[PDB]
Design a protein around this motif. Sequence first.
Motif, PDB file in Angstrom:
ATOM      1  N   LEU A  76      -3.932   5.633   4.894  1.00 21.11           N
ATOM      2  CA  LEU A  76      -3.887   6.993   4.366  1.00 21.11           C
ATOM      3  C   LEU A  76      -5.269   7.639   4.438  1.00 21.11           C
ATOM      4  O   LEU A  76      -6.222   7.165   3.810  1.00 21.11           O
ATOM      5  CB  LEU A  76      -3.354   6.986   2.934  1.00 21.11           C
ATOM      6  CG  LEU A  76      -3.516   8.250   2.084  1.00 21.11           C
ATOM      7  CD1 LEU A  76      -2.938   9.447   2.801  1.00 21.11           C
ATOM      8  CD2 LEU A  76      -2.827   8.076   0.748  1.00 21.11           C
ATOM      9  N   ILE A 135       0.118   2.217   4.251  1.00 23.73           N
ATOM     10  CA  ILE A 135       1.320   3.018   4.035  1.00 23.73           C
ATOM     11  C   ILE A 135       2.296   2.791   5.182  1.00 23.73           C
ATOM     12  O   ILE A 135       1.887   2.622   6.337  1.00 23.73           O
ATOM     13  CB  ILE A 135       0.976   4.519   3.901  1.00 23.73           C
ATOM     14  CG1 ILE A 135      -0.049   4.744   2.786  1.00 23.73           C
ATOM     15  CG2 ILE A 135       2.224   5.356   3.642  1.00 23.73           C
ATOM     16  CD1 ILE A 135       0.381   4.208   1.440  1.00 23.73           C
ATOM     17  N   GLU A 136       3.592   2.781   4.853  1.00 27.58           N
ATOM     18  CA  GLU A 136       4.672   2.709   5.830  1.00 27.58           C
ATOM     19  C   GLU A 136       5.727   3.743   5.462  1.00 27.58           C
ATOM     20  O   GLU A 136       6.189   3.781   4.318  1.00 27.58           O
ATOM     21  CB  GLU A 136       5.277   1.303   5.876  1.00 27.58           C
ATOM     22  CG  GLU A 136       6.031   0.975   7.154  1.00 27.58           C
ATOM     23  CD  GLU A 136       6.247  -0.516   7.329  1.00 27.58           C
ATOM     24  OE1 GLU A 136       5.758  -1.292   6.478  1.00 27.58           O
ATOM     25  OE2 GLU A 136       6.901  -0.914   8.317  1.00 27.58           O
ATOM     26  N   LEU A 194      10.114  13.403   6.262  1.00 26.12           N
ATOM     27  CA  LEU A 194      10.027  12.074   5.668  1.00 26.12           C
ATOM     28  C   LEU A 194      11.266  11.778   4.836  1.00 26.12           C
ATOM     29  O   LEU A 194      11.623  12.554   3.944  1.00 26.12           O
ATOM     30  CB  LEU A 194       8.777  11.944   4.796  1.00 26.12           C
ATOM     31  CG  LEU A 194       7.431  12.016   5.513  1.00 26.12           C
ATOM     32  CD1 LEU A 194       6.345  11.419   4.636  1.00 26.12           C
ATOM     33  CD2 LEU A 194       7.503  11.304   6.853  1.00 26.12           C
ATOM     34  N   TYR A 195      11.902  10.643   5.119  1.00 25.28           N
ATOM     35  CA  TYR A 195      13.085  10.216   4.384  1.00 25.28           C
ATOM     36  C   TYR A 195      12.801   9.128   3.359  1.00 25.28           C
ATOM     37  O   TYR A 195      13.505   9.058   2.346  1.00 25.28           O
ATOM     38  CB  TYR A 195      14.168   9.746   5.361  1.00 25.28           C
ATOM     39  CG  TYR A 195      14.845  10.893   6.079  1.00 25.28           C
ATOM     40  CD1 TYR A 195      14.264  11.482   7.194  1.00 25.28           C
ATOM     41  CD2 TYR A 195      16.059  11.399   5.629  1.00 25.28           C
ATOM     42  CE1 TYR A 195      14.878  12.539   7.844  1.00 25.28           C
ATOM     43  CE2 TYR A 195      16.680  12.452   6.275  1.00 25.28           C
ATOM     44  CZ  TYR A 195      16.086  13.017   7.382  1.00 25.28           C
ATOM     45  OH  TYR A 195      16.700  14.066   8.028  1.00 25.28           O
ATOM     46  N   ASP A 196      11.794   8.282   3.582  1.00 19.30           N
ATOM     47  CA  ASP A 196      11.335   7.382   2.532  1.00 19.30           C
ATOM     48  C   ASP A 196       9.936   6.896   2.886  1.00 19.30           C
ATOM     49  O   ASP A 196       9.550   6.865   4.060  1.00 19.30           O
ATOM     50  CB  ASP A 196      12.295   6.193   2.353  1.00 19.30           C
ATOM     51  CG  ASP A 196      11.985   5.351   1.117  1.00 19.30           C
ATOM     52  OD1 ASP A 196      10.810   5.264   0.702  1.00 19.30           O
ATOM     53  OD2 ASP A 196      12.934   4.769   0.551  1.00 19.30           O
ATOM     54  N   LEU A 197       9.187   6.515   1.850  1.00 19.93           N
ATOM     55  CA  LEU A 197       7.814   6.045   1.972  1.00 19.93           C
ATOM     56  C   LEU A 197       7.626   4.846   1.051  1.00 19.93           C
ATOM     57  O   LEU A 197       8.101   4.857  -0.088  1.00 19.93           O
ATOM     58  CB  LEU A 197       6.823   7.168   1.623  1.00 19.93           C
ATOM     59  CG  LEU A 197       5.326   6.894   1.455  1.00 19.93           C
ATOM     60  CD1 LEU A 197       4.537   8.102   1.919  1.00 19.93           C
ATOM     61  CD2 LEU A 197       4.971   6.573   0.009  1.00 19.93           C
ATOM     62  N   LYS A 198       6.921   3.824   1.532  1.00 18.05           N
ATOM     63  CA  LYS A 198       6.602   2.680   0.690  1.00 18.05           C
ATOM     64  C   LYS A 198       5.219   2.171   1.086  1.00 18.05           C
ATOM     65  O   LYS A 198       4.751   2.403   2.205  1.00 18.05           O
ATOM     66  CB  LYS A 198       7.698   1.607   0.787  1.00 18.05           C
ATOM     67  CG  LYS A 198       7.867   0.770  -0.479  1.00 18.05           C
ATOM     68  CD  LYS A 198       8.349  -0.643  -0.201  1.00 18.05           C
ATOM     69  CE  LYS A 198       8.260  -1.503  -1.454  1.00 18.05           C
ATOM     70  NZ  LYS A 198       8.876  -2.841  -1.251  1.00 18.05           N
ATOM     71  N   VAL A 199       4.567   1.464   0.161  1.00 17.13           N
ATOM     72  CA  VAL A 199       3.164   1.077   0.285  1.00 17.13           C
ATOM     73  C   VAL A 199       3.059  -0.442   0.364  1.00 17.13           C
ATOM     74  O   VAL A 199       3.772  -1.165  -0.342  1.00 17.13           O
ATOM     75  CB  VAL A 199       2.327   1.630  -0.891  1.00 17.13           C
ATOM     76  CG1 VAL A 199       2.881   1.150  -2.206  1.00 17.13           C
ATOM     77  CG2 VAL A 199       0.873   1.220  -0.765  1.00 17.13           C
ATOM     78  N   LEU A 200       2.166  -0.925   1.234  1.00 19.48           N
ATOM     79  CA  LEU A 200       2.028  -2.351   1.513  1.00 19.48           C
ATOM     80  C   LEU A 200       0.758  -2.959   0.932  1.00 19.48           C
ATOM     81  O   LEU A 200       0.834  -3.935   0.181  1.00 19.48           O
ATOM     82  CB  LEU A 200       2.056  -2.587   3.028  1.00 19.48           C
ATOM     83  CG  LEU A 200       3.148  -1.923   3.864  1.00 19.48           C
ATOM     84  CD1 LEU A 200       2.911  -2.209   5.339  1.00 19.48           C
ATOM     85  CD2 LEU A 200       4.523  -2.402   3.434  1.00 19.48           C
ATOM     86  N   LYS A 201      -0.415  -2.440   1.284  1.00 14.84           N
ATOM     87  CA  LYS A 201      -1.670  -3.046   0.872  1.00 14.84           C
ATOM     88  C   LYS A 201      -2.540  -2.041   0.128  1.00 14.84           C
ATOM     89  O   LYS A 201      -2.377  -0.824   0.251  1.00 14.84           O
ATOM     90  CB  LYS A 201      -2.452  -3.602   2.074  1.00 14.84           C
ATOM     91  CG  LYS A 201      -1.632  -4.420   3.062  1.00 14.84           C
ATOM     92  CD  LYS A 201      -1.836  -5.915   2.856  1.00 14.84           C
ATOM     93  CE  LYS A 201      -1.387  -6.709   4.077  1.00 14.84           C
ATOM     94  NZ  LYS A 201       0.050  -6.484   4.401  1.00 14.84           N
ATOM     95  N   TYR A 209      -5.168   3.209   1.107  1.00 17.77           N
ATOM     96  CA  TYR A 209      -3.938   2.466   0.885  1.00 17.77           C
ATOM     97  C   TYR A 209      -3.173   2.298   2.194  1.00 17.77           C
ATOM     98  O   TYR A 209      -3.099   3.219   3.014  1.00 17.77           O
ATOM     99  CB  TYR A 209      -3.071   3.183  -0.151  1.00 17.77           C
ATOM    100  CG  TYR A 209      -3.502   2.942  -1.583  1.00 17.77           C
ATOM    101  CD1 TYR A 209      -4.771   3.306  -2.014  1.00 17.77           C
ATOM    102  CD2 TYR A 209      -2.640   2.371  -2.508  1.00 17.77           C
ATOM    103  CE1 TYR A 209      -5.176   3.096  -3.320  1.00 17.77           C
ATOM    104  CE2 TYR A 209      -3.038   2.157  -3.819  1.00 17.77           C
ATOM    105  CZ  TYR A 209      -4.307   2.524  -4.219  1.00 17.77           C
ATOM    106  OH  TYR A 209      -4.715   2.318  -5.518  1.00 17.77           O
ATOM    107  N   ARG A 237      10.022   3.642  11.679  1.00 17.59           N
ATOM    108  CA  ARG A 237       8.966   3.407  10.694  1.00 17.59           C
ATOM    109  C   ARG A 237       7.588   3.537  11.327  1.00 17.59           C
ATOM    110  O   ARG A 237       7.342   3.005  12.414  1.00 17.59           O
ATOM    111  CB  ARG A 237       9.117   1.999  10.100  1.00 17.59           C
ATOM    112  CG  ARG A 237      10.540   1.797   9.593  1.00 17.59           C
ATOM    113  CD  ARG A 237      10.898   0.445   8.989  1.00 17.59           C
ATOM    114  NE  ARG A 237      12.301   0.489   8.579  1.00 17.59           N
ATOM    115  CZ  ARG A 237      12.906  -0.426   7.839  1.00 17.59           C
ATOM    116  NH1 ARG A 237      12.221  -1.466   7.405  1.00 17.59           N
ATOM    117  NH2 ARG A 237      14.182  -0.280   7.526  1.00 17.59           N
ATOM    118  N   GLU A 259       9.218   6.347   6.931  1.00 15.39           N
ATOM    119  CA  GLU A 259      10.433   6.267   7.729  1.00 15.39           C
ATOM    120  C   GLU A 259      10.892   7.665   8.099  1.00 15.39           C
ATOM    121  O   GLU A 259      10.713   8.603   7.321  1.00 15.39           O
ATOM    122  CB  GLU A 259      11.563   5.569   6.969  1.00 15.39           C
ATOM    123  CG  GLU A 259      11.245   4.169   6.498  1.00 15.39           C
ATOM    124  CD  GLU A 259      12.462   3.466   5.941  1.00 15.39           C
ATOM    125  OE1 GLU A 259      13.555   4.080   5.940  1.00 15.39           O
ATOM    126  OE2 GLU A 259      12.343   2.266   5.603  1.00 15.39           O
TER     127      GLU A 259
END
Lengths: 58, 65, 260, 257, 178, 175, 23, 26
Positions: free
Chosen positions: B23, B9-10, B54-61, B7, B18, B12
């Motif tokens: 992964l 992953i991005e 880690l303060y936030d994590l979000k997924v792109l592809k 996956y 960022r 912050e």
Amino acid sequence: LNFKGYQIEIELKRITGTLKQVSPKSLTLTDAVFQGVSPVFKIKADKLYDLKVLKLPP
Amino acid sequence: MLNFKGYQIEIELKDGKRITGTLKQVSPKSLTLTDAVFQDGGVSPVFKIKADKLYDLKVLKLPPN
Amino acid sequence: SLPLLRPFETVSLENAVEDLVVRFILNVPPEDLSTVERVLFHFEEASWFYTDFVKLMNPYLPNLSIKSFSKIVIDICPLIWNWDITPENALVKFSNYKKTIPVRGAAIFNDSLSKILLLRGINSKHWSFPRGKIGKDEDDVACCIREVKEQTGFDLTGFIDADQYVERNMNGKNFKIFLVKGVPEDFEFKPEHKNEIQAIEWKDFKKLSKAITKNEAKVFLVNSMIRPLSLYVKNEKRAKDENKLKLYAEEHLKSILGLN
Amino acid sequence: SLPLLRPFETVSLENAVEDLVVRFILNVPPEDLSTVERVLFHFEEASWFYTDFVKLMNPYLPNLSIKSFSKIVIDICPLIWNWDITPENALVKFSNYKKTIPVRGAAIFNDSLSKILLLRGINSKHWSFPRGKIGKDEDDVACCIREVKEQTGFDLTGFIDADQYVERNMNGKNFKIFLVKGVPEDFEFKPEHKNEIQAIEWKDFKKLSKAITKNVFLVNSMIRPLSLYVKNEKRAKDENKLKLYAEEHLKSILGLN
Amino acid sequence: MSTETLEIYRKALNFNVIARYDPKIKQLLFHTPHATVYKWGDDNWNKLEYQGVLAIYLRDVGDKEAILPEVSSYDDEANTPHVLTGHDIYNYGLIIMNRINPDNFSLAIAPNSVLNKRKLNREEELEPMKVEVRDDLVMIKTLKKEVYGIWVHTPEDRQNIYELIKYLLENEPTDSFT
Amino acid sequence: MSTETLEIYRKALNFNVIARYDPKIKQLLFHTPHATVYKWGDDNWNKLEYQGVLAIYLRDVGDKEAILPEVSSEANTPHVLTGHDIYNYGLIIMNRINPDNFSLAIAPNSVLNKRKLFAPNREEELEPMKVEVRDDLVMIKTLKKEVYGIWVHTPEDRQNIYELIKYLLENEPTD
Amino acid sequence: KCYAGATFATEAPQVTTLPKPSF
Amino acid sequence: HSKCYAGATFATEAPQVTTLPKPSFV
Ligand SMILES: C[n+]1cn([C@@H]2O[C@H](CO[P@@](=O)(S)OP(=O)(O)OP(=O)(O)O[P@](=O)(S)OC[C@H]3O[C@@H](n4c[n+](C)c5c(=O)nc(N)[nH]c54)[C@H](O)[C@@H]3O)[C@@H](O)[C@H]2O)c2[nH]c(N)nc(=O)c21
Ligand SMILES: C[n+]1cn([C@@H]2O[C@H](CO[P@@](=O)(S)OP(=O)(O)OP(=O)(O)O[P@](=O)(S)OC[C@H]3O[C@@H](n4c[n+](C)c5c(=O)nc(N)[nH]c54)[C@H](O)[C@@H]3O)[C@@H](O)[C@H]2O)c2[nH]c(N)nc(=O)c21
Ligand SMILES: [Mg+2]
């Protein structure tokens, strides 16, 4: 079609506020808290990396 | 599966900085990425980070599959 | 706001036609009076206006079409007709001008890309997208938005992506139909003008696609553009599913690690 | 790498006990031999190892309670027992220790918050949460994932929020059960140990929601704080269909893409 | 209550027990209270189902006609090492008495000097072993090119493990080191 | 086909038509081919439904008993004036959207403050108008306090209207 | 053969670009 | 009687696979 009043967060520094109006070019907030409070806050889509919405005025 | 390997992953850090990468493996305490690109500049073939920072994590592809 | 009167309800046809003349033809800027076509658009607006408004204010007025209307107008106000063309031949030149005006429209989809919004005109004929002719120095998205708002009563401001479109040239008529998704099937669509739109309905896009693949039906343009459309709905539905899997992922990862 | 025999198949009982003593008690770090309570845990894991594996290899071996097993162990290897207290008194001290140990569990909901998985061991007959005791230096979440994965055979590593839980104290015992949803009803559930639990089942959260308001272990003491969560969750899901809508739509009007 | 008595009993019983798994054990060389095993695969570490006391021991291989016994695994796994077959030529052994399940962890150790005698069909598929220690993990590349990582509970033994295995690889049998 | 003929016919016919809506019209003063109107409220402009030619004209109020007509049957819609007809000037947009035209009364400041000096103070309460130009928009504060903005097509006229309107506000009215 | 309707048909600006009255 | 835990003191001390170094011969 209108989403004014939703609880909104924007990022780059993070701003939280109430949506006053939205257009393809501009975004306005009220009672914006700063990563500081401000009664009116003007921001352009150019300075926004990302947007998220959590809460609604209903 | 329990694994989300492949996956995109991005993540912050504390100053909104960022990191983007693929992964490699994840456990409750640590997160490993490959070919991590950094917002402020710099690439790294393997990047290991702890969930503490880690303060936030979000997924792109999704993985190419 | 001074109080005015309503002479259209009580004037002879002649004075009503004079009123329409000061409203639509007499006072327009010079460029609108440059060619027979430029003014014939104003004749057209005036005739539509007569049919929709003043004829229903004074039922003693006759039922006119644009041909009879142009006749009567040039009868009562001769000083506006500046050319030596029969108003009928001028009408054929008007249609010839319309033949090559770019048309911008919109393929409109439900958020679940199951149905597509189509309409049929007064002569029921076939179905097609909300569409319209381009105006003076206007962007294609402004034209699409304006025309779908007049034809349906719906504003496509945020829904139009200026790069997702289909372009087809049929008879020098340049058709460009944008692709939009996420409009509510809830909305009640009314046309802004009567005697223009016969019906506005959603159609099952799967059943409609199977139907256009008939042995030989009931459709204009959509049959010509069906494969790019279907492709668009494939990428969009598939992308929605991928957004679902993606969401499942990010939530689970934020569970493995600590959000709090 | 090297071919090793399986002595447990053919070996006498005394020597099998010796094997177990090497595995579980003889070589533990000194930190685990500090008190009677600490060593008795190694005695316990050793006994379970005997029942679940060794008894299976050699059926000619006897069924051994924890008490009997402890007896045979202290008789065959007397040097691993350095307290002069009776093992049957040491067991009651052991129970005095296992009553002040925290315990974590999980409320297991499907997508439809109709059903909630509870388990029933053989002796109790009254249903309860999947839960267990904490280890040393263990996050409450990792703990919950481990015991729930043990009793129900299901990995909850991606289903737990450190904030959706509720805790109460019985008799100095700090309980703590998290609240999870979206578990697949389809996927089977089995205890990792064959002889711990009789049945693991769920029925409709409503079908016996108020069967307990006649006045079921522990779940009743936290049904009200749980009920708030489940109803909040259903209407927050109906909301979930909407928040997405607003989000993506606002995103399309800007350069978010 | 005696420390020396208990030490003697620990070494003796450990020998008596390991002997029933590896009947060719000759002397306990090293022992550490706890060790956990990971296998390397898919460019990633994978925690294995092995945990317990670890011991490195010397083996009797003077008999040059003994072949390693044949035992069926019976499957009581996702990935299991290649159990060595053929003639018994392996001077040293490592074992983890497993607390998790009754299958113990086993590694054979042979010096390079022994395995490079292949010159002049073979039943063996042996490659010189490797060992390195980093970030408190003891990584080993075995004679059949499996890669394992042993994590020792007591920290001052971690290095002590490495330095022993390395020795056993550079020199022929001597009966000489701790 | 003569420019002088067409302009006379335009003035005469425009007067003939506007007189059928405001019978008190006396003389056309100004005209511009096209104008769009917006109303201001809620701190943003709203585009109203009036569009077409704009005419500023003089009105006849020599009569003093002049009383306004009436309609044959929330604050978004304007207030149509009642009471005494004392408005010297008028603005009208001849609409191409629907039959209803846009009307704005224009009373100078002198006539208004002079109207103050009248015992009953019962006739409809008014306020002096204001007029402004900003970025090509012509904003007007009406007697009824409503505020509108006009976008005239012809650029040169944007100034003209303003001055004229300003003129019609500042000076005493005659001829 | 370029456009349709009035030359001023689409010239009216959007409210978001208009000045505030301020008087 | 508080702060009490169960099982082996080393039960959860083994580090997770995501924190271990990569071998220098693979
Ligand atoms: C505003 N208003 C209108 N009306 C009355 O109702 C009629 C509709 O108004 P338009 O005259 S502005 O016409 P539009 O529909 O907007 O454009 P188009 O008809 O010129 O042409 P395309 O359909 S975009 O096609 C271009 C070319 O391809 C040919 N074609 C067209 N169709 C539908 C088909 C088809 O189904 N199948 C095939 N094979 N070809 C097709 C097309 O023929 C052309 O060559 C007006 O006429 C008015 O009568 C109003 N009435 C009133 N009272 N008030 C109003 O405001 C009004
Ligand atoms: C790993 N393994 C387990 N087993 C089988 O289980 C037996 C050992 O017991 P556990 O320690 S694994 O846990 P539990 O059986 O749940 O008993 P608890 O006392 O440790 O703790 P709470 O039940 S969460 O309760 C806390 C305290 O309050 C008392 N209590 C209990 N109940 C049911 C109630 C009630 O209904 N109402 C009130 N007011 N209080 C209640 C409770 O007594 C406790 O003191 C072993 O014997 C096995 O059967 C295994 N078996 C095997 N073969 N292998 C394994 O590895 C294994
Ligand atoms: Mg049209």
